[PDB]
Assembly symmetry: D2
Homo-oligomer: 419 residues x 4
């Protein structure tokens, strides 16, 4: 079934078809002059997928306030309906990332709805950074690393429950992000808290299926404002290495200290086989959770440059889990996710354009200027025609947001859902 009427998609595509053909053929000629087959690029782009977060489908907020828009999803099922629009139009988000207990519901029905909507399920996300109804022990002072054994045990069990839910819907991974840390010096004993966390994670790993992966996600601060147990990629590596082969690190772009060279962290994790995946978003100050590429698009490209280089170097068994993790506080969540997915494919596409042979030559000869210019020749290329054509060829929209607004989808759900 189609959330967006097929005639609206066709109409909006036909209206822009002529211009797209002109832009695509022109770019094709330009790339051919550069020794690149535009068709080979498009083919790869239409294959690049990134999972959408269920928690990003509704309007987000801050500790200061939340300003909901119209037609806010009432639960996971409405969220899946809205996620179906993102996939239908961009064709880059076939899978949805669930968060428990927020999306708690009959797995069987979740699966049924997903299949009907043409959606799949990516990594499960546990939640021990907030208390649930009827919960016996509070996570106020931590969860997996809490000083109280009973609390750690409760956190572990919750994670195992997430695994059972995921197994029922076709998920093959569990992502663990906790707020565990301290707001005051002395509040926690850094080492003992980390020891407790490792012990609890070992239990989760013990209950992890052999066809699943376990992702730990580091974050410098927030909700903890002095120390955080899994504060950076260094601690994250120690975690993954200690836990086992099925345990890897997840890198969320907005979770690093100011000025951090994040693309280097990505390369380091790849070299040691611990790059489990990504949580895409953009930011300027802290963990802003803004639309990917909206603030520093070149950084996004540089991260993808390390991903594409890994293949070029011949790295094996490298299949990162790509996921979007954003908060949409002042825009229509669907439009933001649409353009964010587009931005991610944009950076990927540009990374594919890099002349690796030329770059390698300039790196060996220490020709810094030509090396950086080689990356820019790729980054400066406007790949929108390729992105648009990929969508068109796969059942999507030439201009996703334009088609979305032309459909009146938002007003529609605004009438079907409360206020």
């Amino acid at each position: 079934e189609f959330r967006i009427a097929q005639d609206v998609v066709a109409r909006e595509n036909d209206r822009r078809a002529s211009a797209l053909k002109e832009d695509y053929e022109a770019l094709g000629a330009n790339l051919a002059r550069r020794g690149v087959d535009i068709e080979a690029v498009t083919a790869k782009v239409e294959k690049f997928f990134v999972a959408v977060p269920s928690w990003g489908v509704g309007t987000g907020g801050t500790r200061f306030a939340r300003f909901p828009g119209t037609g806010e999803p009432r639960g996971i099922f409405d969220k899946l309906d809205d996620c179906a629009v993102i996939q239908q139009l961009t064709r880059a988000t076939p899978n949805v990332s669930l968060h428990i207990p927020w999306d708690k519901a009959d797995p069987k029905e979740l699966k049924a709805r997903g299949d009907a909507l043409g959606l799949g399920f990516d990594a499960m996300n546990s939640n021990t950074f907030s208390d649930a109804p009827g919960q016996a022990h509070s996570y106020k002072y931590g969860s997996l690393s809490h000083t109280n054994a009973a609390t750690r045990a409760q956190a572990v069990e919750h994670n195992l429950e997430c695994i059972e839910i995921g197994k029922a819907i076709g998920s093959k991974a569990l992502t663990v992000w906790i707020g565990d840390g301290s707001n005051f010096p002395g509040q926690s004993n850094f080492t003992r808290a980390f020891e407790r966390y490792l012990s609890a994670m070992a239990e989760i790993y013990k209950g992890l299926p052999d066809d699943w992966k376990l992702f730990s996600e580091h974050k410098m601060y927030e909700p903890a404002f002095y120390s955080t147990v899994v504060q950076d990629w260094g601690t994250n590596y120690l975690i993954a290495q200690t836990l086992g082969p099925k345990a890897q690190c997840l890198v969320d772009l907005g979770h690093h200290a100011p000025n951090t060279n994040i693309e280097m962290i990505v390369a380091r994790l790849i070299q040691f086989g611990k790059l489990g995946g990504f949580h895409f978003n953009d930011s300027k100050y802290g963990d802003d959770d803004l639309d990917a590429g909206a603030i520093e698009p070149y950084r996004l490209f540089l991260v993808f440059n390390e991903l594409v280089d890994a293949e070029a170097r011949g790295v094996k068994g490298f299949h990162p889990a790509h996921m979007i993790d954003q908060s949409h506080n002042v825009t229509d969540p669907i439009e933001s996710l649409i353009n964010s997915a587009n931005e991610i494919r944009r950076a990927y596409a540009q990374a594919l354009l890099v002349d690796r042979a030329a770059l390698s030559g300039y790196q060996e000869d220490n020709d810094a200027l030509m090396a950086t210019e080689t990356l820019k020749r790729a980054y400066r290329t406007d790949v929108e025609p390729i992105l648009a054509e990929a969508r068109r060829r796969t059942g999507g929209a030439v201009d996703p947001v334009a088609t979305y607004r032309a459909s009146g989808y938002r007003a529609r759900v605004a009438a079907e859902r409360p206020a």
Copy 2:
């Protein structure tokens, strides 16, 4: 009224009196060898006050979750009862800073309760960074700088109402902090948004009594994550200078970019007569709103060094409105505010110990090492005895938190107030 039984305070003070006398007398001798009269210091310390935020006596949270404790205050009246405890025990927080609409209530009752509790009222705080029930225009895309004229007018009207409430309870200032800004490049036109803000604030300024002050508070980011209209002290200065003599700038410790030299900003505002006041707290990453001095006590001292240097050089027309602005997410809010107020007096006391003449000499001689060492000799001095003695002589507790816990106050209000439920934050 005495929130904390006098017998407990006396009991807990006598239990520590002997140790205090020994420490106080020892410190006094040391200071004497330093040409300092401990009594002169203690006298000023007893008179140093910092306002407490009404919204700070309740447990705070993040966008991810809130973990309330027991006996959470229901509203302004419970909050005043809790603030009274802080004042009774530390004697450093005689005034409370109200926030509207949160603390909206009959002005007469507020004033009545404050008087009974021995609490006065500091600067009023307006709220146009969130929407209230029945609100005609949403502040989602801004308030005083919103592109919609009606929305700005509504924001202006609200601020004027805050001034009316303040006049009825004894307040003499309005503090304006808004979230206005943008999350994406292009979303806002920086200049036009600021022009709109200046015009709206000019309307609020017109409603100020002659003995009132309007304080604008800058913040680099949050809730806006790309740009903020009142992002730094520079923009804040432009506001104060444009609005008028009664308009000044408020400096909130955690509202600056990483590595910012905050004490310099303080010195600059003082130099140009626009230091309206301070919003105390500490931080390590962003606007963490942590207990004052819990992360960087030296920085807190350095800020007070600028305050004392001015307070000494006569600098007339210098009466900064000091207030604590913190969020207590993992501690009993009352205990945190108590120790925070203590840390602020600690920094003050230490700044008072600085040998101004010696420092001036080293500055003129460019003796950087001795200059910084002159500051350290004051900072390194454990002034706890002075703080404890000041509290004792004014009806406070030698060890505030120890007395607070010995009184069983938290268990008391926990048994009088409805239970609270932990929940998520505004993230979803």
Copy 3:
């Protein structure tokens, strides 16, 4: 001609076919967007940025300096090299001189410039290092030094820079100093600033009627605890205090981490104190890297503010544009060439923004379409426009490739002896 004309012609011819195809393709695309590529090219070809005489030589850090071959031996060699950048990019007709590094007879400097087809931008004073025979050291400051005699000496040096500038055609004096402290208590923040203000008022006194005095703020380095002119707030107070001729200069790499620099630019413009820019890029501190090599979008956003100013019709708005970089691991000439290109690139893209649509989205608070409107301009590859602007004005379609084909570096390497001590 520093670079042989036949080389430029040959290299331009070699790339003519591809340029035509890309330019005309871009022209059609822009036309579909209601933009006249010819109008953009006409503006781009007139956008100039001054080159720092001190950036033509290889730079270094406190840890080491690794010079390349043919390092300029003095200001005259530097002008010769600056002529190469201008001839090939046609984007840098003016040079920024630094005194005493570039001290020489004004008559000869002017004559050399005229002969090379170069002009002179704002003069730059130097009281952040000690020169031979100096009566007072700037170790503890200059214009804000506690010692009156030291400040007087600093003032006289700045007045001397104005005299030199008047003789060569300059119309401004840029003042950046290292004055500050490395320890709390070392300096009295207020008194230090007052001393600076008094010294600057004297310098202002020596300004011709058509001259400007630019003060440049910097968060830290060389001072590591406090700096007198630490940020734009202090900078604004300086310009407002000094007078009409005093304005603020924004050096991109001089701000605290995560600072929204484009907002500072907008604020200074609103209050008429944006004197000019020192373009460069950075990731950590005042890295002084090639403009746009690290955060090209930020560079674009700064230009978006400059162009919006023109759109809003700000009166008498003529910021002084200058590159202030250090080239530690590349051929200084090649980096300056590509840096000048990046600046014209960001400028060109800013010109492409559909202001009409943007204006609408800002009013309707359509944040997504507003940012997408900026992106549609930024994502456009304007290289064809930059290349055509150069072709039309006697420059090179691909500046660096032409520079390399000319063998210039090897030429000056043989002509210039490397310093031995």
Copy 4:
């Protein structure tokens, strides 16, 4: 003796009375807290930190260096000055050498050291700068350079440092390089790191059985885009990969803004890879300022982690501490003296923490009392302890005061020719 004994005795007696009063008063206060001041003093007088040979000379920035009087030239002058610091503070018995700056006949070095009462700590290699007559430049890197012969040269140099160290009593080699890139694409992050790991493996092979190899991470400078050994994560990967004799060095000012450094210290200790800590303070970047002059609490929190480990004696926890600072505006000797003092101060205060009480508040999640338990130790003025420790071990009650009374600076000023005067 560098400083006349009668001067030391005179200035000590001058302050003996007040010191008695303060020490006895603190001893009483500590007794009421269940702490025996004598146990603290005994440990403090035994706490040492190596002094960098390159720290006694005036430091500079990329803009300038303002030398003071009596600047030490050569390792022999430097050792003479380092002897003053040790004699007065008794906290710096060992000096860390840097090759090739301090190159000299090992036997003469060992001799001068023994004569001055100074030992030698970790050796420090230098492949972040080029020495005259060098076959291959380190402009584009050293141990991770793309050119094999260049890496081989860097490796050989480090081995030579080990040979020098074995001859003078050293037991470790510290490796800090500037290797990195200033532009995206310039280096392939992974390949560069692979080359570095391979080169370090060769150096590791040259290590005696009782030697250690320390690698030092740094976020940036001299490289302003990427640095091979950029943080503790990469550093840990290096140490774990090389072997048991390889550990990581943590330099306070080499971290990203707001980094929780004390946690990094805890993590490395937990995994047995904390080789040592390089002390200094900072506010903006790698400012290399006097320890504790900016954030003394942070210094205390680092020692809180160190003392907690020293108490339990953790596996492989035997840190090799050193001061790594640059003194640009003070008498280097005085700064090193007060920096060593601050280090012992934070150590003494950390020793005062009631670990039992702390652990109790941590287990009950009583955050307020836990942080207050730390503060009760930190707020304690341990100067009386530091001064008594010095007095008992042949040092000065007030180091800097005694230094100034001795007229030492004026003395070496008369023996050493300044660059100009």
